[PDB]
RNA sequence: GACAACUCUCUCUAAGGAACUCGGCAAAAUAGCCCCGUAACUUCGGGAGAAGGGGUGCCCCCUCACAAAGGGGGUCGAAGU
RNA sequence: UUCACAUCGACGGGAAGGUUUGGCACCUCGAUGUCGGCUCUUCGCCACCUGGGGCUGUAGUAUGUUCCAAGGGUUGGGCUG
RNA sequence: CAUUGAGAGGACCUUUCCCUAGUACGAGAGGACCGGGAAGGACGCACCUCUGGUGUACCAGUUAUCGUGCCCACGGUAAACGCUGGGUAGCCAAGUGCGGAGCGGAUAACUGCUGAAAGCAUCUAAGUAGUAAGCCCACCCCAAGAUGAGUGCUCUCCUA
RNA sequence: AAGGUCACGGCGAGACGAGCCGUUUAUCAUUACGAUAGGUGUCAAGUGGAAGUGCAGUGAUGUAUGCAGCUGAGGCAUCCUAACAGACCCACAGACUUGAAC
C-alpha cells in the first residue's frame, strides 16, 4: 500500500526516471516554458526548485552540486551567475504550472511550466 | 472460461447503454471547461 | 528461537559437545523455543569417554540464544551461540562446571543452574 | 449501551513512559483539538432511548452545513466537526447545553475501552485478510498464495456463503477493551494511555470506560 | 502564555528527557566509545552491576536513546541494549574511544573476538 | 495515468539450515593467479584442479631474469581476482 | 474368591447405517479426467480430549464403563507413491 | 447529521504450576474437581514506543570503464540500482498492547422438594429447587432495499 | 433554494466509483477554530565526517577548518507557487380517506 510514500514516480523505472527528471529540468532552465504531462510537471517542480535555491548560494561546492545534476554545462554557469538577481528574496516557490488542453492521441493531461 | 450461451438483445442493450452513458457523464465536464474558457480570468490554457 | 532441528552448543562439561533439539517440552507451542525452556536434545557428538554418547536422547535447557531477549528494565541480551545445559527433570544439571554467562531471571526456576555460573550477569 | 458517558480524543503518536519503578511501558498519547461538549440528551419518552450527544473539533461555520449549524445553535453551543452520542443506561442527568466535561473521571476508572477507525489497507488478498497459508513455492508448484480450493463437488453445487474470499481489509471502526489509563497531565490536557490504539496519529478516537 | 501546538508529542518527549538529564548527567556517547555502566538492579544486596563494553551503535529516539554494547564474556559475545535515560542506570562512564570510521558497527560482530574484548 | 489483490522476471530477509519434499528438484553457496599438500584404490596411464590451507588493494625500496614475479616496510576499507 | 449382569460375555436371535469388499447393471462412451499430497472448506456422530452424571469388585490418585454433550480441539517427524 | 435496532456475522477455547494442604483419605505408599492466584499455548483484533526485516527517497566504501578539455571533484553504465555496509517514514514480525466476561434466562443427562393415582411408595401426574464448554441474551463489528423501507432536531423554499 | 455534483489543491482513503479534508485577502486580537499540496526556513532523524585551502609525509595516505557535508515523503513556521474561472443537477408546499381538539 502507498500509505506514507511520497516520492512522485513516473511511468518509468528508477534509472530512466532519474534521467527524465534531469534532462527535463535542464530544458526548463533553458527555455522557461515547457510542455509536459501534469505528473512530470509536479516531479519537475520539486527538483527545479532545488536547483534555483542551489544557485541562490553561489559557493563553489554548491556550484559543483549543480554542475553534477544538470546535463548541459553552460546553462549552469548562466544560471547561478544570473539568478541571485532574478530570485532575490522570492524565497521559495519559483515555478508555475499553468495548464492546458490534453494531448490528441492519448487524451493525456498536459501542462505547461513557467518560471515565476 | 468459454461462455455457454449468447446473451439476449435485452441484456446487451443494457450494457451498451451503460457504456455510452458513461460517455454521457463525461461531456458536461467538458462543457463546463468550455463555458469557463470563454474569455475570463483564469490560470490555464496559455 | 529454537526450531526443532538446531545444533546447540553446551554450556557445561557434562560431556556433550553439540546436540540436536527435538520438539521442546512444556509450552504447547514448540514452533519456537526460547530462553528458560526445555528441549529434547539428541546428542550429536561428544568427548569420547563420557556417559553421554553418540545419539542418546536426553533432556536439556536453553541458556543462550541468538535471538533477542527482552527484560523488565528494558534491556535486551543477545549472545552469539545457541547453547544448552543437560538437565534432570527434578533439578540440578549433571555437568558440574558451567561456561559463559546466563540470564538471571531463569534463577526463579533453575536455581542450581545459576549458582554454578561464572557470570550470572 | 455503555457503562458511562465517554469522551473522544485524537491519537497523537506513541512513546515510552519510564515508570519510576524502572520498568519500561509503551503508551500512546491522546489529545483534544477542541473540548467535548454535550449537545443533546434524549429521553425514553420524547425519544426511544437514553443517550447524550457530545461533539468535538470546533470549526469555522463555513465548513459546516445549515442543518448542522442549526442543530448546534439550538442548544447554544460552539461549532464542532465531529459529533457522536453515547447511549447510556437510562440515568441521564445532563443539561444538553454545553456541560463541558473533563477527565476528572477516567483516572478513577483505571480501565478504558476506546473505539477507533482503524487504518485502511485497500483490497488485500486471501493470504493476509484471513491468515490463509500458501502452497509450496517450489517443487513444480504453480499456485502460490492463491486462494486454493473453494468448495466440494456437485452436491453443495455452489460456494457456501460467508466464504473467506479476498477483499477490503481496514477502514471500519473497532473497539479495544480493558485498556488501562496512566499518568495524565491536565496542564497539557494530554492522556498517556498505555497500549496501542486504532489509527495513525490524527484520527478521532472515542474513549469510554469499560463494559465488564 | 499561549497554548501548546497540535504536534505536542515532540515537546512531551523533550520534557521527559530534560528531567532525566537533570537527575543524572550523561556524557555524550558516540559510536566507538568504551563505556562502563553502573546499574541498579532489584534485590541483589549489592545491585551495582558493572557492564563494560564497546558502544556498537546508538539509536537516538527521545527517552529511548539507547546504546547497544558488545563485550566478550567467557566465550560468547554478550550484546546488550541499555537505554540511557532509564532511571535505573546509577551512572555511566565513558572510558576510551576506539576511533572507528562508521556509525553502526555490526561488523564488529562476527570478526575475530580479539577486537571486541572491551 | 495510478499505483489493490494476484501471475511472471528479479533483489533482500531477523533466529534456525532440508525440519519442505516423491527426491535439497529449484535457489544460495564455491570459483581467478600464485604457494604448501594431495589419500583409498590402479589396467599402474590415472585418480587429481583429489581433499584441504594460505596470500593477493595501493605506495616506497633492491635484489632474482636483473622484460615479469618474489623479499622488506607502510597506508586504507567492514569487505582487496 | 461366593455373586449371570463392576467388567467379559460362549451358544443362537432381532435391527439401523451406508462409508469397505461386493451383486445388478438404471443414467453418463459426439467423452462423468483416476490414487496420494498442498490450500480451503463445511457437515454427521453412535465422544478420542476438554463440560457436567450415574454405577464401580470407586479408600484416595488412577480408572472401567455407560448418560446428556459436536462449542471447540483433534502435533512434529523417520519409512512407503 | 445523530441514530433504535429485526436480521446476519466473529468470538466466548485449553494446559501446567502455587494457596487451600500434605489437608481429607489411607497400614503405608501415595495424595483430593470446593474455591481462588500466576504463568503459558493456539487463536483473534490491533499498533509502531522498543528490538529487528525491507525500504530501488537517502548517505557512505569501492571495482571496470566512458563522458564533464585536463588533475581534483562528479555524472552515466553493469536483465531493477554494479557489488557491498547503514537507515527515517511506510508496510511488516520472530516486537509490542489487549482479549475471551459479575455474565443473566431457559434447558438435556442427573440429583431433588411437597404428593396422590394405588387408605405405603414413587423427582411427576398438579406445582416447584439445583445444574453442562451445549441453547438464547450479553461481548465485538455491519445493519431501515427491515420495500414491514423506523426514529428526531435541524434546514429548504408557498412569486408563478 | 436547503443540499449536492463537477471543477481546483491533496490524504494516514483508494483497483475505478467511494470516503475525508481543503478551495485565498487563506484573520487580527487578550487562552483553542482559516495553512490543502508544493517550495522555502528551521528542528528532530539518517549517514557519518564534505569542498577548497593549510600542515606532516618522497608517495599511498593522514590531519585542522568540522557531529561539518550532502540528505529534510516526519514536526512547526512561511501565502512564494497552485486551489482562478466556472459549470450542472436541485424547485413552488408535498394527490385520496375518515379521526380529534378550538
UniProtKB/Swiss-Prot annotation, chain A:
Highest taxon, organism lineage: Eukaryota
Keyword Isomerase: no
GO MF entry, a single one: rRNA binding
Keywords of this entry: Chloroplast, Plastid, Ribonucleoprotein, Ribosomal protein, RNA-binding, rRNA-binding, Transit peptide
Subcellular location: Plastid, Chloroplast
Aminoacyl-tRNA synthetase as UniProt keyword: no
One biological process term in Gene Ontology: translation
GO cellular component: chloroplast; cytosolic large ribosomal subunit
Protein task: Component of the chloroplast ribosome (chloro-ribosome), a dedicated translation machinery responsible for the synthesis of chloroplast genome-encoded proteins, including proteins of the transcription and translation machinery and components of the photosynthetic apparatus.
HAMAP family the record matches: Ribosomal_bL17 (MF_01368)
Subunit composition and interactions: Component of the chloroplast large ribosomal subunit (LSU). Mature 70S chloroplast ribosomes of higher plants consist of a small (30S) and a large (50S) subunit. The 30S small subunit contains 1 molecule of ribosomal RNA (16S rRNA) and 24 different proteins. The 50S large subunit contains 3 rRNA molecules (23S, 5S and 4.5S rRNA) and 33 different proteins.
Family statement: Belongs to the bacterial ribosomal protein bL17 family.
The name this protein goes by in its record: Large ribosomal subunit protein bL17c
Organism whose genome encodes this protein: Spinacia oleracea
Gene, per the UniProt record: RPL17
Curated annotation (Swiss-Prot), chain B:
GO annotation, cellular component aspect: chloroplast; large ribosomal subunit
GO MF, any single term: structural constituent of ribosome
Keywords attached to this entry: Chloroplast, Plastid, Ribonucleoprotein, Ribosomal protein
Highest taxon of the lineage: Eukaryota
UniProt feature coiled coil, ranges: none
Location in the cell: Plastid, Chloroplast
Primary residence: plastid
Any one of the GO BP annotations: translation
Similarity field: Belongs to the bacterial ribosomal protein bL32 family.
Function: Component of the chloroplast ribosome (chloro-ribosome), a dedicated translation machinery responsible for the synthesis of chloroplast genome-encoded proteins, including proteins of the transcription and translation machinery and components of the photosynthetic apparatus.
Subunit and partners: Component of the chloroplast large ribosomal subunit (LSU). Mature 70S chloroplast ribosomes of higher plants consist of a small (30S) and a large (50S) subunit. The 30S small subunit contains 1 molecule of ribosomal RNA (16S rRNA) and 24 different proteins. The 50S large subunit contains 3 rRNA molecules (23S, 5S and 4.5S rRNA) and 33 different proteins.
Protein name: Large ribosomal subunit protein bL32c
Source organism: Spinacia oleracea
UniProt gene name: rpl32
Swiss-Prot record, chain C:
Record's subcellular location: Plastid, Chloroplast
Annotated InterPro entries: Ribosomal_uL14 (IPR000218), Ribosomal_uL14_bac-type (IPR005745), Ribosomal_uL14_CS (IPR019972), Ribosomal_uL14_sf (IPR036853)
Xref: SMART domains: Ribosomal_L14
SUPFAM superfamilies the UniProt entry points to: Ribosomal protein L14
Domain of life, source organism: Eukaryota
Entry keywords, A to Z: Chloroplast, Plastid, Ribonucleoprotein, Ribosomal protein, RNA-binding, rRNA-binding
Name of this protein: Large ribosomal subunit protein uL14c
Subunit composition and interactions: Component of the chloroplast large ribosomal subunit (LSU). Mature 70S chloroplast ribosomes of higher plants consist of a small (30S) and a large (50S) subunit. The 30S small subunit contains 1 molecule of ribosomal RNA (16S rRNA) and 24 different proteins. The 50S large subunit contains 3 rRNA molecules (23S, 5S and 4.5S rRNA) and 33 different proteins.
Family: Belongs to the universal ribosomal protein uL14 family.
UniProt KW Ribonucleoprotein keyword: yes
Coarse class of the protein's main subcellular location: plastid
Organism of origin: Spinacia oleracea
GO biological process annotation, one example: translation
GO cellular component: chloroplast; cytosolic large ribosomal subunit
Function per UniProt: Component of the chloroplast ribosome (chloro-ribosome), a dedicated translation machinery responsible for the synthesis of chloroplast genome-encoded proteins, including proteins of the transcription and translation machinery and components of the photosynthetic apparatus.
GO molecular function: large ribosomal subunit rRNA binding; structural constituent of ribosome
Swiss-Prot record, chain E:
Major localization listed first in the record, in broad terms: plastid
A GO cellular component annotation in the UniProt record: ribonucleoprotein complex
GO MF annotation list: rRNA binding; structural constituent of ribosome
Keywords: Chloroplast, Plastid, Ribonucleoprotein, Ribosomal protein, RNA-binding, rRNA-binding, Transit peptide
GO biological process, one term: translation
Keyword Ribonucleoprotein part of the UniProt annotation: yes
Location(s) in or outside the cell: Plastid, Chloroplast
Summary of the function given for this chain in its UniProt record: Component of the chloroplast ribosome (chloro-ribosome), a dedicated translation machinery responsible for the synthesis of chloroplast genome-encoded proteins, including proteins of the transcription and translation machinery and components of the photosynthetic apparatus.
SUBUNIT field: Component of the chloroplast large ribosomal subunit (LSU). Mature 70S chloroplast ribosomes of higher plants consist of a small (30S) and a large (50S) subunit. The 30S small subunit contains 1 molecule of ribosomal RNA (16S rRNA) and 24 different proteins. The 50S large subunit contains 3 rRNA molecules (23S, 5S and 4.5S rRNA) and 33 different proteins.
UniProt record similarity statement: Belongs to the bacterial ribosomal protein bL19 family.
Protein name, entry field: Large ribosomal subunit protein bL19c
The species this protein was found in: Spinacia oleracea (Spinach)
Shown part of the complete sequence: 115 to 232 of 233
Amino acid at each position: 500500500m502507498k500509505h506514507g510514500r511520497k516520492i512522485h514516480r513516473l511511468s518509468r523505472p528508477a534509472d530512466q526516471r532519474r534521467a527524465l527528471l534531469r534532462g527535463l529540468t535542464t530544458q526548463l532552465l533553458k527555455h522557461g516554458r515547457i510542455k509536459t504531462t501534469r505528473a512530470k510537471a509536479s516531479a519537475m517542480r520539486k527538483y527545479v526548485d532545488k536547483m534555483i535555491t542551489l544557485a541562490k548560494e553561489g559557493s563553489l561546492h554548491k556550484r559543483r552540486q549543480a554542475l553534477g545534476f544538470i546535463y548541459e554545462k553552460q546553462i549552469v554557469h548562466a544560471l547561478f551567475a544570473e539568478v541571485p538577481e532574478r530570485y532575490g528574496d522570492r524565497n521559495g516557490g519559483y515555478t508555475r504550472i499553468i495548464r492546458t488542453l490534453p494531448r490528441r492521441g492519448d487524451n493525456a493531461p498536459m501542462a505547461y511550466i513557467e518560471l515565476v | 472460461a468459454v461462455p455457454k450461451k449468447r446473451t439476449s438483445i435485452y441484456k446487451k442493450r443494457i450494457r451498451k447503454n451503460i457504456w455510452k452513458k458513461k460517455g454521457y457523464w463525461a461531456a458536461l465536464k467538458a462543457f463546463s471547461l468550455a463555458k469557463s474558457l470563454s474569455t475570463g480570468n483564469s490560470k490555464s490554457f496559455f | 528461537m529454537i526450531q526443532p532441528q538446531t545444533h546447540l552448543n553446551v554450556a557445561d562439561n557434562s560431556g556433550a559437545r553439540e546436540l540436536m533439539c527435538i520438539r521442546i517440552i512444556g509450552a504447547s507451542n514448540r514452533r519456537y523455543a526460547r530462553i528458560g525452556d526445555v528441549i529434547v536434545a539428541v546428542i550429536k557428538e561428544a568427548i569420547p569417554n563420557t556417559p553421554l554418547e553418540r545419539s542418546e536422547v536426553i533432556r536439556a535447557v536453553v541458556v543462550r540464544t541468538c535471538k533477542e531477549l527482552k527484560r523488565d528494565n528494558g534491556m535486551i541480551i543477545r549472545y552469539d551461540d545457541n547453547a544448552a545445559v543437560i538437565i534432570d527433570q527434578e533439578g540440578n544439571p549433571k555437568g558440574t562446571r558451567i561456561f559463559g554467562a546466563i540470564a538471571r531471571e531463569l534463577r526463579q526456576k533453575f536455581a542450581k543452574i545459576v549458582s554454578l555460573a561464572p557470570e550470572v550477569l | 449501551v455503555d457503562a458511562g458517558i465517554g469522551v473522544m480524543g485524537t491519537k497523537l503518536g506513541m512513546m515510552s513512559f519510564f515508570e519510576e519503578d524502572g520498568t519500561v511501558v509503551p503508551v500512546t498519547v491522546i489529545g483534544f483539538k477542541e473540548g467535548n461538549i454535550v449537545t443533546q440528551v434524549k429521553t425514553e419518552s420524547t425519544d426511544g432511548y437514553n443517550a447524550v450527544q457530545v461533539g468535538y473539533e470546533r470549526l469555522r461555520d463555513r465548513k459546516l452545513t445549515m442543518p448542522e449549524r442549526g442543530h448546534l445553535n439550538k442548544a447554544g453551543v460552539i461549532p464542532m466537526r465531529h459529533l457522536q452520542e453515547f447511549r447510556l443506561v437510562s440515568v441521564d442527568d445532563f443539561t444538553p447545553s454545553q456541560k463541558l466535561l473533563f477527565e476528572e473521571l477516567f483516572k478513577e476508572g483505571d480501565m478504558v475501552d476506546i473505539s477507533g477507525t482503524t487504518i485502511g489497507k485497500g483490497f488485500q488478498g486471501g493470504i493476509k485478510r484471513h491468515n490463509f497459508k500458501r502452497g509450496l513455492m517450489t517443487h513444480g508448484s504453480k499456485s502460490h498464495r492463491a486462494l486454493g480450493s473453494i468448495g466440494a463437488g456437485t452436491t453443495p453445487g455452489h460456494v457456501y456463503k460467508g466464504k473467506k474470499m479476498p477483499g477490503r481489509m481496514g477502514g471500519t471502526k473497532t473497539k479495544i477493551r480493558k485498556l488501562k489509563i496512566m499518568k495524565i497531565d491536565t496542564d497539557l490536557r494530554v492522556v498517556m494511555i498505555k497500549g496501542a490504539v486504532p489509527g495513525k496519529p490524527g484520527n478521532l478516537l472515542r474513549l469510554a470506560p469499560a463494559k465488564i | 502564555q499561549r497554548v501548546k501546538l497540535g504536534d505536542i508529542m515532540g515537546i512531551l518527549n523533550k520534557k521527559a528527557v530534560h528531567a532525566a538529564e537533570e537527575l543524572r548527567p550523561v556524557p555524550g556517547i558516540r559510536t566507538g566509545d568504551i563505556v562502563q555502566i553502573r546499574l541498579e538492579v532489584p534485590e541483589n544486596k549489592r545491585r551495582l552491576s558493572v557492564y563494560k563494553g564497546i558502544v556498537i551503535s546508538r539509536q537516538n529516539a527521545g527517552i529511548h536513546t539507547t546504546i547497544r554494547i558488545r563485550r566478550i564474556i567467557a566465550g560468547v559475545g554478550v550484546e546488550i541494549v541499555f537505554p540511557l535515560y532509564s532511571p535505573n542506570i546509577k551512572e555511566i562512564k565513558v572510558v576510551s574511544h576506539r576511533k572507528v570510521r562508521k556509525a553502526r558497527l555490526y561488523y564488529l560482530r562476527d570478526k575475530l573476538p580479539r577486537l571486541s574484548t572491551f
